[PDB]
Design an enzyme around this catalytic site. Structure first.
Site, PDB file in Angstrom:
ATOM      1  N   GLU A 157       2.772 -10.767  28.810  1.00 31.45           N
ATOM      2  CA  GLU A 157       4.034 -10.343  29.405  1.00 31.45           C
ATOM      3  C   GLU A 157       4.646 -11.482  30.209  1.00 31.45           C
ATOM      4  O   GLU A 157       4.742 -11.408  31.436  1.00 31.45           O
ATOM      5  CB  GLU A 157       3.799  -9.120  30.306  1.00 31.45           C
ATOM      6  CG  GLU A 157       5.057  -8.370  30.747  1.00 31.45           C
ATOM      7  CD  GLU A 157       5.206  -7.040  30.031  1.00 31.45           C
ATOM      8  OE1 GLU A 157       4.616  -6.897  28.945  1.00 31.45           O
ATOM      9  OE2 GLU A 157       5.888  -6.136  30.560  1.00 31.45           O
ATOM     10  N   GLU A 275       1.959  -2.192  22.749  1.00 32.19           N
ATOM     11  CA  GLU A 275       1.712  -1.156  23.755  1.00 32.19           C
ATOM     12  C   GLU A 275       2.817  -0.122  23.691  1.00 32.19           C
ATOM     13  O   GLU A 275       3.974  -0.492  23.548  1.00 32.19           O
ATOM     14  CB  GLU A 275       1.704  -1.742  25.180  1.00 32.19           C
ATOM     15  CG  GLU A 275       0.536  -2.659  25.533  1.00 32.19           C
ATOM     16  CD  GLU A 275       0.657  -3.178  26.947  1.00 32.19           C
ATOM     17  OE1 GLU A 275       1.302  -2.490  27.773  1.00 32.19           O
ATOM     18  OE2 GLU A 275       0.119  -4.274  27.228  1.00 32.19           O
TER      19      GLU A 275
END
Ligand SMILES: *CC(=O)N[C@@H]1O[C@H](CO)[C@@H](O[C@@H]2O[C@H](CO[C@H]3OC[C@@H](O)[C@H](O)[C@H]3O)[C@@H](O[C@@H]3O[C@H](CO[C@H]4OC[C@@H](O)[C@H](O)[C@H]4O)[C@@H](O[C@@H]4O[C@H](CO[C@H]5OC[C@@H](O)[C@H](O)[C@H]5O)[C@@H](O)[C@H](O)[C@H]4O)[C@H](O)[C@H]3O)[C@H](O)[C@H]2O)[C@H](O)[C@H]1O
Ligand SMILES: CC(=O)N[C@@H]1O[C@H](CO)[C@@H](O[C@@H]2O[C@H](CO[C@H]3OC[C@@H](O)[C@H](O)[C@H]3O)[C@@H](O[C@@H]3O[C@H](CO[C@H]4OC[C@@H](O)[C@H](O)[C@H]4O)[C@@H](O[C@@H]4O[C@H](CO[C@H]5OC[C@@H](O)[C@H](O)[C@H]5O)[C@@H](O)[C@H](O)[C@H]4O)[C@H](O)[C@H]3O)[C@H](O)[C@H]2O)[C@H](O)[C@H]1O
Ligand SMILES: [Ca+2]
Length: 347
Positions: A157, A275
């Site tokens: 991320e 995710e």
């Protein structure tokens, strides 16, 4: 040798239903030098066992993402603690043994938390690129012998130095991320062996998918062909778990638009939803104590996500909720109706 090279698209097509072993090897914040188990359990998850990976495979899942956070396991010179690398290796083997696909990444070394050091920023990139390449060299070498069922994901991320969650505030940020991506592919490939043709995963800025993030994403150059996958995450519609009653047309349309945008952007390379889940504002999310209506909401999200990804030759990995905490030890599903909706949608 038993290795059998497989294209990126073939791998993604074989992933089937995926699950994230979250808050486990990615857990961090207790400090350096601790026993391996202290880290693994620091965020409330049990130590991973072979039984867990077997349970996933035997109940309709064929891929597991294994987030790993590395910085508390690296010394001043960037060498990874041997005890830690062996545990990462051990959990990978659980997955390999069960016949699963597995993804190993670099997780909370990115984003907004303390200890994060990989950032979409020119100065950060300059100061950390050697450490990043040395980290991936070590990971690649440590996991070199696993076959094509094991994939590497460069970074989770990545944000700029402002922790901007939509886009970097400065365009130069994209160039940093793209450079990290290239260095990752380069370092892995350079170790040779199976890593010369292993399928590798590169993530967009913030694992986001807004128009600018997609436009400014550029796939690293790779000498071998069809061995790169792009990853984004999808907790969409944002905060739906706290604002929606039912998974309605607005929700469905949101997802169908997302997959259309992804498939339009990425034409020759596969992409994955690395995710997804109900996690929204203040990371509020579904659990078995949620109202029946809210659990059905989660089930409906998952069923749609799973089906749309199948339609788009993609694949998905559930973030944590369906197989969590003490339920992992039984082993049993935390959210059996959510899993049943996913199984039905996929099959
Ligand atoms: C873009 C995208 O898709 N991102 C993905 O989003 C996923 C969903 O949010 C995310 O998973 C979540 O990750 C967070 C960790 O996030 C932090 O690090 C990354 C930063 O970018 C982010 O800004 C930070 O918030 C997980 O949060 C952790 O949860 C642990 C367990 O909490 C659970 O059980 C306990 C209960 O109280 C909680 O309500 C329940 O959620 C929690 O563990 C506790 O830690 C403290 C120690 O805390 C210190 O060290 C860790 C630091 O994070 C913390 O700030 C500091 O105070 C222990 O003393 C307690 O005993 C532990 O229980 C962690 O503190 C908390 O950070 C979240 O659960 C997870 O869903 C994906 O990773 C991401 O890719
Ligand atoms: C004509 C008209 O009126 N148009 C309307 O214009 C509105 C203003 O732009 C717009 O509302 C914005 O919508 C966007 C997204 O809109 C669509 O696409 C994504 C779908 O999920 C969504 O349902 C659709 O409607 C919203 O974007 C979200 O913003 C979140 C943070 O925003 C909030 O906090 C910051 C503040 O400045 C904002 O005002 C406030 O609303 C952002 O949060 C972060 O998410 C990550 C996890 O991200 C993963 O999962 C979500 C995926 O979307 C993402 O790709 C993936 O990486 C967390 O880890 C962070 O902690 C969060 O902070 C969401 O990611 C982002 O989607 C925007 O907020 C909203 O104002 C109307 O839609 C439009 O019709
Ligand atoms: Ca396609």
């Amino acid at each position: 040798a038993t290795y059998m090279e497989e294209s990126a698209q073939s791998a993604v097509d074989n992933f089937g239903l995926g699950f994230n072993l979250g808050n486990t090897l990615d857990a961090n914040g207790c400090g350096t030098g601790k026993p391996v188990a202290t880290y693994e359990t620091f965020w409330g998850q049990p130590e991973t066992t072979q039984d867990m990976m077997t349970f996933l495979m035997q109940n309709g899942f064929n891929a597991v993402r294994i987030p790993v956070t590395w910085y508390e396991h690296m010394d001043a010179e960037g060498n990874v603690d041997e005890a830690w690398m062996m545990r990462v290796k051990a959990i990978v083997e659980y997955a390999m043994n069960a016949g699963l696909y597995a993804i190993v990444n670099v997780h909370h070394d990115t984003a907004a938390g303390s200890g994060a050091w990989i950032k979409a920023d020119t100065d950060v990139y300059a100061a950390t690129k050697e450490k990043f390449k040395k980290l991936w060299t070590q990971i690649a070498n440590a996991l070199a012998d696993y076959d094509q069922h094991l994939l590497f994901e460069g970074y989770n991320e990545m944000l700029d130095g402002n922790n901007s969650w939509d886009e970097p505030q400065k365009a130069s940020g994209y160039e940093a991320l793209n450079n990290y991506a290239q260095d990752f592919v380069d370092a892995v490939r350079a170790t040779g062996g199976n890593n010369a043709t292993r399928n590798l995963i590169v993530n967009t800025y913030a694992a986001a998918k807004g128009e600018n993030v997609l436009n400014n994403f550029m796939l690293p150059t790779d000498a071998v062909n069809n061995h790169l996958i792009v990853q984004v995450h999808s907790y969409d519609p944002w905060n739906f778990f706290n604002t929606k009653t039912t998974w309605d047309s607005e929700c469905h349309n949101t997802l169908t638009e997302i997959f259309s945008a992804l498939s339009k952007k990425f034409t020759t390379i596969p992409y994955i939803i690395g995710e997804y889940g109900t996690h929204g504002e203040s990371d509020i999310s579904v659990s078995k104590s949620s109202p029946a209506e809210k659990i059905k909401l989660a089930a409906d999200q998952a069923a749609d996500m799973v089906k749309l990804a199948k339609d788009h030759h993609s694949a998905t990995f559930y973030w944590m909720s369906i197989f969590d905490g003490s339920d992992r030890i039984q082993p049993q599903w935390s959210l059996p109706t959510v899993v049943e909706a996913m199984q039905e949608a996929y099959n």
